[PDB]
Design a protein around this nucleic acid. Structure first.
Ligand SMILES: Nc1ncnc2c1ncn2[C@@H]1O[C@H](COP(=O)(O)OP(=O)(O)O)[C@@H](O)[C@H]1O
Lengths: 50, 249, 195, 117, 195, 49
DNA sequence: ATATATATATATATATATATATATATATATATATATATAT
DNA sequence: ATATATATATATATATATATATATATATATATATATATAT
């Protein structure tokens, strides 16, 4: 909340309701980082398989 | 011919070996050594690491993303509930709505997953298991290198796994009259009503401590006032702000 | 292994498909051969969902579709058959030919004497509605171009030495001339109003 | 999902009955003898993937008697997957093999002698 | 009772006739229908003095003039075929396209259909023989005129947005190397004419 | 031994025949061909262009 | 000055693609009956 | 030794998802007529 507040100070963009949700209301927590290391460990396993 | 072929395929273990009969025992030593020791060791190594990777593999990432989308599903309900306690119009209140995304990448991931499940049960010493694992990991790699693309976003971001919508609710019967801004138009100045209302409501909810019927903190900052909006929109916004009991600056 | 189809049946069926319609007075041998092998011809055509219609009174054979009965395509459409929508001038000339063919078949028999009319006789009927195009040469050019287009449609023959065309029996074999009757009624009403 | 241990324990419990031993000797119609293994379902297969696979592994290693196998479809699986369903013992010798106790051998031999001795 | 052909067979054969060729990669259902009753297709084309050509390596079906008790003489005189006869510069461009096709085949195999070349890629090949009209647009017009007809025979796709064309597998048989030798002989008689 | 070594490094020509005291003529024909073209001896003028 | 070829306009018909509705199959939930184990 | 309590196996019903058929829109190919330009 105490960063959403900071977002409110500059609210000017309201192209879409769902866009507003995705950009201000929710949080991202995207797991790109997890996938990178998962695949990199899969490489090590692939070496043994080869 | 046979020994020349073997040395051709040889990685280097037979580099010093020659090409005549007397060298034959050297080759046979490598044959028996590989058969007895090397291959079982490598088999155990590969299958053991795969079994470890089976628990630590992509399945955990998929479960985590499902958990995050579930969390999003949870919280949206609470804000939706709070809106029942107030009115967006003198005779109406407002309700949230959501739906699932259908970008084909997710269906491809579904198929890859459902195929990978069976492959673990194939009796092949983990071969088809590994093949399916590689095939599925291909999607994750491709999405990772193209994280910017909306397809990768949908693959990895919980926010892009679903879509949102809002319904106009009858305060009297609780029925829906419309689910679309059927009055949008002009220079785009009308959209601001619903967007501002929902953002204000979410900010109001976020500042209520555990079970707090009111927000414990009441200051709100709106720089540039209403630069984009017209006259009456500001009045609507300020009335809504009053309803939630904030202290505008 | 399996025997071949008889040569003459094949040749006649292909001939009719190429021409669509044919006359015993034109090629009597093929006419009789086909009428002596109608089952074979239709068996040749049914895989195409095609068949033949005949008129021994006027002495004409002609193709006909043999699809399954009355699908949703009442305005039928067939793969091997591309359909057409002749223009209001073409339709006007067809209506003129229809009316005078009807008259001929009473005053000269139902194809007993091949239906005929002179160029100088058709031209006034068109001139009733279209008026004078500007010259006799223009009239003849207009009517001759339209008649040639109809001939390509298998409806009329070229004018004889006396500028008299012969009307193919196929005119009597049109499907729904009620549209032609309505069109002719509209034309006569319009010219009566526009005069 | 019964591992071979539970079926073996049930057979031993049956062995505790002297009447069951006496009938299974005097009435060969008691044979062949079998016990079910379990009832696979998608509710188990869907997220117990590794556990179910390990149970199937454990049953794959059984040799005594015979184990029934066939493919079961599940919602999470793209195709049917082989599963074990039954474990079959054909003779009193197989039942004794399952029981595997010194008292079991004592009683088996002693009774097979008493009937003649 | 009636000899009505099964509806699916009629559909497949009607489409094949309408376009004269049928690729499994494009229309697998009709292709498999044809190869499920190819003897039926033969016995239906046999009445019409036509025959079914099959090339499963490229998953292709095409219709070809049959031999009657007379081998169709100049088979292009067959009543049914709607198009004209092939003629030289079409054969020249067909030879060049087949050269590129065989190059692509050596590169990646026979059954696929990914081969392509641009309008400007084509232009020098013919420009060798046909001389320079005096403007690039004119020679492009020449090439597009050729490609329109060849598409009319099913050899090539239409000029795409990139000004390229896709070789159709059927060219493997129009450029039948036996027919290429026969055409080389015919070219030698053309030399004799020039002599 | 030498025929097998040649087969190892070949690309597209020795692929056809085997290696025996009766296959020999193919090898020599290929060597004659790769001598006619004198191809390997353009190298240090092409590296300029 | 005339005839032929070409380009464009009208325009119509056909094929292809995509979306939605319906029908079917499979899976899961609930209830009941039976078998087995424990206790008296 | 027999009774009873509990577990599990089965059967049926209903809900859900997936496959397929059909309806409609759009794009293109034919296609034919007419007008204009150019060749002889
Ligand atoms: N795509 C559209 N969606 C909604 N309204 C539209 C749309 N296109 C035109 N309009 C209508 O036309 C007008 C567009 O807004 P206008 O009045 O031109 O804007 P402003 O005057 O605020 O610059 C409004 O009357 C609006 O309802």
């Amino acid at each position: 909340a105490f960063t959403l507040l900071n977002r409110a100070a500059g609210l000017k963009q309201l192209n879409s309701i769902d866009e507003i949700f995705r950009e201000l209301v929710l949080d991202d927590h995207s797991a790109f980082d997890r996938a990178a290391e998962v695949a990199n460990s899969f490489d090590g396993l692939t070496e043994i398989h080869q | 011919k046979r020994m020349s072929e073997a040395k051709r395929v040889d990685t280097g273990a037979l580099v010093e070996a020659g090409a005549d009969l007397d060298d034959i025992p050297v080759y046979l030593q490598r044959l028996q050594e590989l058969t007895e020791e090397a291959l079982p060791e490598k088999l155990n190594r590969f299958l053991d690491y795969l079994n470890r990777s089976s628990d630590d593999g992509v399945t955990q990432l998929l479960s985590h993303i499902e958990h995050e989308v579930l969390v999003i599903e949870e919280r949206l309900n609470e804000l939706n509930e709070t809106m029942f306690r107030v009115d967006f119009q003198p005779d109406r209140y407002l309700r949230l709505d959501t739906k699932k995304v259908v970008h084909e990448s997710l269906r491809t991931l579904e198929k890859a997953q459902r195929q990978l499940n069976a492959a673990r049960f194939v009796d092949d010493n983990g071969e088809s298991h590994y093949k399916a694992l590689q095939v599925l990991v291909a999607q994750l790699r491709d999405a990772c290198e193209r994280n910017r693309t909306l397809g990768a976003k949908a693959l990895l971001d919980p926010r892009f796994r679903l879509e949102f919508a809002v319904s106009v609710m009858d305060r009297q019967s609780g029925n829906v009259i419309e689910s679309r801004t059927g009055s949008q138009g002009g220079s785009g100045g009308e959209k601001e009503i619903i967007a501002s209302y929902v953002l204000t409501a979410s900010l109001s909810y976020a500042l209520c401590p555990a079970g707090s019927r009111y927000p414990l903190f009441g200051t709100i900052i709106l720089d540039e006032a209403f630069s984009r909006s017209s006259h009456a929109v500001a009045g609507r916004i300020i009335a809504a702000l009053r309803e939630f009991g904030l202290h505008a600056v | 292994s399996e025997t071949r189809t008889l040569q003459k049946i094949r040749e006649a069926t292909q001939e009719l498909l190429k021409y669509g319609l044919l006359e015993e007075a034109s090629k009597p041998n093929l006419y009789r051969i086909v009428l002596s092998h109608p089952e074979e011809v239709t068996r040749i055509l049914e895989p195409l969902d095609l068949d033949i219609g005949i008129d021994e009174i006027r002495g004409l054979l002609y193709v006909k579709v043999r699809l399954d009965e009355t699908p949703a395509q009442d305005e039928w459409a067939h793969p091997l058959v591309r359909r057409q929508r002749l223009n209001l001038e073409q339709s006007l000339l067809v209506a003129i030919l229809r009316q005078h063919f009807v008259a001929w078949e009473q005053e000269s028999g139902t194809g007993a004497s091949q239906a005929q009319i002179a160029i100088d006789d058709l031209l006034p009927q068109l001139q009733i509605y279209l008026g004078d195009p500007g010259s006799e040469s223009k009239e003849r050019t207009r009517l001759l171009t339209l008649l040639d287009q109809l001939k390509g449609h298998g409806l009329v023959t070229s004018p004889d030495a006396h500028e008299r065309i012969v009307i193919r029996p196929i005119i009597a074999h049109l499907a729904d001339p009620i549209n032609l009757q309505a069109l002719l009624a509209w034309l006569r009403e319009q010219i009566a109003q526009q005069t | 999902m019964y591992s071979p241990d539970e079926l073996r324990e049930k057979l031993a419990r049956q062995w505790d009955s002297a009447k069951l031993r006496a009938e299974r000797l005097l009435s060969p119609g008691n044979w062949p003898l079998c016990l079910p293994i379990g009832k696979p379902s998608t509710k188990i297969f869907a997220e117990q993937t590794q556990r179910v696979l390990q149970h199937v592994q454990r049953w794959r290693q059984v040799a005594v008697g015979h184990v029934e196998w066939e493919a079961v479809s599940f919602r999470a699986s793209d195709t049917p997957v082989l599963m074990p369903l039954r474990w079959i013992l054909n003779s009193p010798s197989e039942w004794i093999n399952a029981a595997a106790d010194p008292v079991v051998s004592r009683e088996f031999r002693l009774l097979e002698g008493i009937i003649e001795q």
